Structures are given as structure tokens and as C-alpha cells.
Amino acid sequence: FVEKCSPIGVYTSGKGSSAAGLTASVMRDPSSRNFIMEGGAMVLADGGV
DNA sequence: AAAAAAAAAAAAAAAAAAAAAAATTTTTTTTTTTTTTTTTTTTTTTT
Numbered sequence: 001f002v003e004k005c006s007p008i009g010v011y012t013s014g015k016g017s018s019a020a021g022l023t024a025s026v027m028r029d030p031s032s033r034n035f036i037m038e039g040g041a042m043v044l045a046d047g048g049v
Numbered sequence: 050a051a052a053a054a055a056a057a058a059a060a061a062a063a064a065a066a067a068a069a070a071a072a073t074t075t076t077t078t079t080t081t082t083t084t085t086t087t088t089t090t091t092t093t094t095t096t
Contacts, residue, residue, distance in 0.1 A: 031083065 008048025012041040 003011035016022040021040035029036055037043075 031081095 002049060006049035008045055010041045010045035010048070016041065 003009040012020065012022055014022070021038060022042060023040040024043040025038045025040065027036050027038070028034070
């Protein structure tokens, strides 16, 4: 309910969700050399719950 | 001195050579980017 009720809200387990992380992870693309930041629950639910 | 004939001048039309003009997208390559994979190496877990 809290996840559905908060303006910004994400519900996740301790070990993250199915193909989603609990916290952000930064990687470097070998080809484009960009910094790809996979957003976990903590970063995705920024300013919310 | 004038008229008739001859010849020349001017002008216009036609032809030949030579310089000018017009027309003129498709096919193949290949580089970069992205993904895939094989091995090495590093980290984590277990005893």
C-alpha cells in the first residue's frame, strides 16, 4: 500500500527485483566509452519512498 | 551630245568546314557501431 500511495514509490526485496537492482551500479561501455548508470531501487525512488 | 551596249559595284542568298554546345546516376566498397564469445583472471563461498 505504501508503494502504491507514495507519489514516487518503489517496492523491492532485499536482493532487488527480477532484473532490477537495489542500488545504482556504474559501468563503462567499451564501445562508446559512456558511463551507463543502471538505476537501482534506491536511486529510482529518489525523493520518494 | 546623246543613246546603246559593256562592264563594274553593290548587295543578297547559299554552302562547307570547323569550332562550340548539350547531355550525363548507378553501383560497389568500407568504416563504424554493435553484439557475441572464449579465455583469463578476480572475487566469493566453503571447509
